[PDB]
Amino acid sequence: AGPSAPKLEGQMGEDGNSIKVNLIKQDDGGSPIRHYLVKYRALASEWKPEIRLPSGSDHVMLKSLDWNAEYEVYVVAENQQGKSKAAHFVFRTSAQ
């Protein structure tokens, strides 16, 4: 039970490996949502030191990743009355 997994919109910075993951909400039940659990990995190493967002954020970010590499970002959310499944955002970095 609980909210539905967030929708992750991808904004890539012209730096080549600067990634902003925007967390769009849709169904929670009056938005009783609490922060996000964000963990991501690349096509080289898995699960990097994950991060927990503030209690009610808008996005999560990662900077200075491997060039010409693929990345997987998994974002879970918490809610007053339980947890909300993980949504998966996938992208690739630019070339150095």
From Swiss-Prot:
Cell location: Cell membrane
Q: Which residues form the Fibronectin type-III domain?
A: 2-96
PTM per UniProt? Answer: Polysialylated by ST8SIA2 and ST8SIA4. Polysialylation modulates cell interactions by confering both attractive and repulsive properties that are highly regulated by ST8SIA2 and ST8SIA4. Polysialylation is formed on a-2,3-linked sialic acid of core glycans.
* Taxonomy, superkingdom: Eukaryota
Subunit architecture: Interacts with MDK. Found in a complex with SLC39A6, SLC39A10 and with NCAM1; this complex controls NCAM1 phosphorylation and integration into focal adhesion complexes during epithelial-tomesenchymal transition. Interacts with synaptic plasticity regulator PANTS.
Q: What role is this protein assigned?
A: This protein is a cell adhesion molecule involved in neuron-neuron adhesion, neurite fasciculation, outgrowth of neurites, etc.
Q: What is this protein called?
A: Neural cell adhesion molecule 1
Gene from which the chain derives: Ncam1
